[PDB]
Amino acid sequence: PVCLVVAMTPKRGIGINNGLPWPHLTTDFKHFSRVTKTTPASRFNAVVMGRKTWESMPRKFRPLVDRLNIVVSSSLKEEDIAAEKPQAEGQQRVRVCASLPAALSLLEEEYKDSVDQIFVVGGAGLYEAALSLGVASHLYITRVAREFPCDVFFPAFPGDDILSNKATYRPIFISKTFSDNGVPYDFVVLEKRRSSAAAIAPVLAWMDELIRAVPHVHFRGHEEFQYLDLIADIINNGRTMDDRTGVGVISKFGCTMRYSLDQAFPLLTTKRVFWKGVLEELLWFIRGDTNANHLSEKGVKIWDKNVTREFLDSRNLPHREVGDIGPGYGFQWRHFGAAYKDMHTDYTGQGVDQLKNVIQMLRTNPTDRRMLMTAWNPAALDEMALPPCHLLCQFYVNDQKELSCIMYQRSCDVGLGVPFNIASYSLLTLMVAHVCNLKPKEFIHFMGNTHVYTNHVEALKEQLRREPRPFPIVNILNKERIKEIDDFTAEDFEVVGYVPHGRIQMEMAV
Amino acid sequence: KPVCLVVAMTPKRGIGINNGLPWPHLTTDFKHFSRVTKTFNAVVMGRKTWESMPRKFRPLVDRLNIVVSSSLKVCASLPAALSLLEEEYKDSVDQIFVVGAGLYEAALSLGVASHLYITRVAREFPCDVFFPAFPGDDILSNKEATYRPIFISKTFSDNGVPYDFVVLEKRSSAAAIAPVLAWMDEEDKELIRAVPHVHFRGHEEFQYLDLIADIINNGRTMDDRTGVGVISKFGCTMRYSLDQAFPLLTTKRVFWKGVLEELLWFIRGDTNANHLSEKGVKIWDKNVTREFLDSRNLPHREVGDIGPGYGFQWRHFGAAYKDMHTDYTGQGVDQLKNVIQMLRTNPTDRRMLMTAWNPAALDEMALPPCHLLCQFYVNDQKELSCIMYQRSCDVGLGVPFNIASYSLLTLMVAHVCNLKPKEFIHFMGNTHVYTNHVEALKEQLRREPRPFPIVNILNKERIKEIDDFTAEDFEVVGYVPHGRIQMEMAV
């Protein structure tokens, strides 16, 4: 009964020119070593590999230490390998077999009592045979999120949708996202399916008491499970309420998520997020811009329905031109408290530039505890097309020059807005880290009224049947040119290794 | 042979009076009692205790009963009743429970009880029968084998009586996954933990105790404005239920008078700290001395003037500040009034927030506000919840005070809106322990929490609007904390 261990691009690519397609992934090698070596004593595990895989390995590491090595080949002989390098004392002699079935026979015949687990370690010849024989119980797959030139591929398999969009192999384990050398990746395991404190439990018994994301996944390390579980939690436990929009709501109050920013970027994968939209909106905020036509004109229409003639009038703002969000978000960030006129006015130097203050405090006194920016100005709310939802953020620097950010959001459309908000403030954290010579560490999301609209519930349930993919990496390009927060442009960003499931249509509650 | 005692007692160990119970009917305690005693089982009770039971329940059903009188229609002693359980009933008897005094004290002297199931009634009541003193006693009030708590429930209440439940003891797919979890856990000296002997930690105060432990264990050592130094973390969260009891911390006495007076002071939009100090509430004095104000570049401020902070922003957001003797009536935005009006007319609105954070006015304040935003929420059962966001949290000194403060605001706002208080949710930014508090906090972490008290609003009929509350309209009922712990304020 065998296990497969592999690293794989989303297109199932595993090799090129008898080498690996990506730069060195040190955590993946640790993992490989740890999975293939470990045992309870008497025994060792075996690794079975094809001839070219054996040849692809550097001499100094071959044979793989403390594991019985078997090579499947018809041309290489056991004495070829013995001649390559002296067998070290205590290690096993390297065996050669003509086929995978022969390797498994040999294991039974001559190494019962001696080997514990059997691992098939590549290449495509062996992976294919192992799947054909149906002898693989588990797949240890390292999912590399970037595509690389490959000439060798892991075979198609039922359940290969954990890699990319199109007996079965279902994931029972999904880790958080790692990275090395600009490459994001994660680890999954698939499974072939087809009176101490005794007497305390009756008090527990009487004090004690449906929708769930991909419930077969038992180890839920991927940080996107916070979002997926929050959807389920609201649907299971939330309360059905009315709402400003007339569309129903199911709501909860006081919710929390947090996303690491040191290895990869929390752009959700369980549906495609509108990244051009987040980037363009954030730059617009940073400008202090209140003209949503500037967004609309670039193909970002997110503010259009709340800046129509009709919606502005429902807000008693007949004097606003279409597109004018009033003194909201970016205006309050860059010009807190300034007297608003319209979206065409120059406000340079009016009011408080909170963003500048935060940055200057980060650069000069990062232990200060007042590094906040707010968009909630009670005096100006009635002049806004919409009172801000994400209304405050706070920054923090630790010991090691690592920057974390908290954002408070009064109102959270879990279906439509939340993924977008996660990406937006995570990006702001990247931008601020760079300009302050800091390392981005963490985004922390504090949520007030956290809701899913009734007309989203069905689509959200489909979303919960999808397992997450490894997070992408976002790189800031042209770092040397970029010295201040206003220097960033729409071209200074690269999203690397993003492989989300398909878009899900969800109407905005207007 | 294993024996357990089931009891409910006041902090002074009171269990009865005039052959009855001291307190009004405790519904949940009775459930608890029912369950615990059956899973047949034997309950064993003294003569008088049998009488006290109403006849409709007198045979305690689904359990063997034993009365230990020497005068009735049934053993003559407690040793006797234990013999009668080995000899006969040896089979089909699981555990045995003793359920009066005399019986309790017999069971303790003979040393046969291995566990104590105690319902701690938080209030005192007249009693003439008391549970025996016993080592482990401090679990009730502040007054060799010993009894150690192993379980401490959340706080309940019925008929205006707060109470707790504690238990004391006499003293392939997982295989596939394993190697992967193991390496992920590897990286990565002696952790502290609040009362590690308590396994089942239902008491909501454990959030605060665990928070202290987590900061000291996993926080990073940093500098800070005051010069004292802290250990800090960022982004922490607690929540306290308000429907049964009130989260006034019990592992050290919280300064309740101070909480109440500061809050009423906020609500009036008062910015003169001498009004607090003149009432014996000196919490703001060191941040409004001549010296501190000058350090803030405020030489023109009069001693005691906090500037346009907290309450001023609540009641007059954005108004132009003069001094603390000015009348600001009608000026600025009355956020508190707006919040209340929205709660009363359209409680599904998602903009029910109040902020103290006004960037245009920060430099004019003695201290930028720590608790700077709160948001309210109503469900479909008319239950009110409140979230407060705090940018900077002095865990040892400030946090217990802040918890009580906003929980109290929640009770007040619920009342004038004809809602019921449900939950206070505490969101924390820079969450820190000052270096000179660490030792004191380590003492505190050795204390088992007591049941939370309940706070009642008095004269409810007179109180219609948030401004109507006075310092005399509240009663804290059943508060039984451990002693105060001195913690010096970093200025």
Ligand SMILES: NC(=O)C1=CN([C@@H]2O[C@H](COP(=O)(O)OP(=O)(O)OC[C@H]3O[C@@H](n4cnc5c(N)ncnc54)[C@H](OP(=O)(O)O)[C@@H]3O)[C@@H](O)[C@H]2O)C=CC1
């Ligand atoms: N990303 C990853 O996880 C991994 C990537 N790689 C790499 O993948 C590509 C190399 O693998 P691949 O090209 O498939 O090389 P293989 O390791 O499969 O070696 C190829 C050959 O191995 C022996 N052979 C294999 N299958 C059979 C069979 N089914 N029956 C009989 N003999 C068999 C044969 O050698 P003979 O001709 O002597 O008979 C066949 O020619 C490389 O890039 C290697 O580095 C490898 C392992 C893992």
Ligand SMILES: NC(=O)C1=CN([C@@H]2O[C@H](COP(=O)(O)OP(=O)(O)OC[C@H]3O[C@@H](n4cnc5c(N)ncnc54)[C@H](OP(=O)(O)O)[C@@H]3O)[C@@H](O)[C@H]2O)C=CC1
């Ligand atoms: N808070 C709680 O959890 C509980 C409180 N209570 C309160 O109990 C009061 C009664 O307790 P208490 O007055 O101590 O009543 P008991 O139930 O202990 O009855 C007293 C007597 O019981 C039999 N007895 C007890 N001890 C001995 C002994 N050591 N040797 C021989 N016989 C013994 C005797 O009756 P005889 O004279 O016939 O020999 C002794 O006089 C009430 O207020 C009752 O409600 C009771 C249960 C629980």
Ligand SMILES: C#CCN(Cc1ccc2[nH]c(N)nc(=O)c2c1)c1ccc(C(=O)N[C@@H](CCC(=O)O)C(=O)O)cc1
């Ligand atoms: C949060 C936030 C910012 N916002 C601003 C914004 C404004 C009003 C709102 N109103 C409501 N009820 N919910 C929102 O989330 C919301 C968000 C967004 C608005 C729309 C989309 C959106 O429609 N996303 C879709 C469809 C459009 C597209 O892709 O072009 C998507 O699936 O990407 C995203 C973000």
Ligand SMILES: C#CCN(Cc1ccc2[nH]c(N)nc(=O)c2c1)c1ccc(C(=O)N[C@@H](CCC(=O)O)C(=O)O)cc1
């Ligand atoms: C929260 C809040 C409101 N506040 C306001 C307030 C002002 C400045 C602060 N400064 C610091 N560093 N931490 C605080 O918690 C703090 C709190 C409080 C202030 C003091 C006490 C208090 O109990 N002080 C102690 C110790 C005085 C001393 O000797 O230093 C006392 O003796 O009671 C409580 C609440």
Ligand SMILES: Nc1nc(=O)c2nc(CNc3ccc(C(=O)N[C@@H](CCC(=O)O)C(=O)O)cc3)cnc2[nH]1
């Ligand atoms: N997930 C996965 N990642 C891989 O890199 C991988 N590689 C191969 C084949 N190629 C190689 C090449 C070198 C070493 C190697 O030197 N291994 C050392 C790593 C030691 C360590 O980091 O502790 C070993 O002793 O395992 C292993 C396999 C087969 N399955 C894989 N599977």
Ligand SMILES: Nc1nc(=O)c2nc(CNc3ccc(C(=O)N[C@@H](CCC(=O)O)C(=O)O)cc3)cnc2[nH]1
């Ligand atoms: N913790 C504790 N609380 C008590 O009230 C208590 N009471 C007694 C003695 N008095 C009483 C009185 C009535 C019932 C009683 O009627 N018990 C029923 C019903 C419980 C219910 O009404 O839900 C039972 O079988 O549990 C039990 C004990 C002994 N130990 C106690 N221990």
Ligand SMILES: O=c1ccn([C@H]2C[C@H](O)[C@@H](COP(=O)(O)O)O2)c(=O)[nH]1
């Ligand atoms: O950044 C944003 C902006 C808006 N929304 C959705 C929040 C709500 O479901 C609706 C906003 O309307 P009110 O909360 O103002 O009713 O905003 C978000 O989730 N994120």
Ligand SMILES: O=c1ccn([C@H]2C[C@H](O)[C@@H](COP(=O)(O)O)O2)c(=O)[nH]1
């Ligand atoms: O309600 C309050 C007021 C103050 N503090 C303590 C917060 C800090 O440790 C110190 C305030 O100083 P700065 O955060 O402003 O530096 O305030 C609180 O914990 N709660």
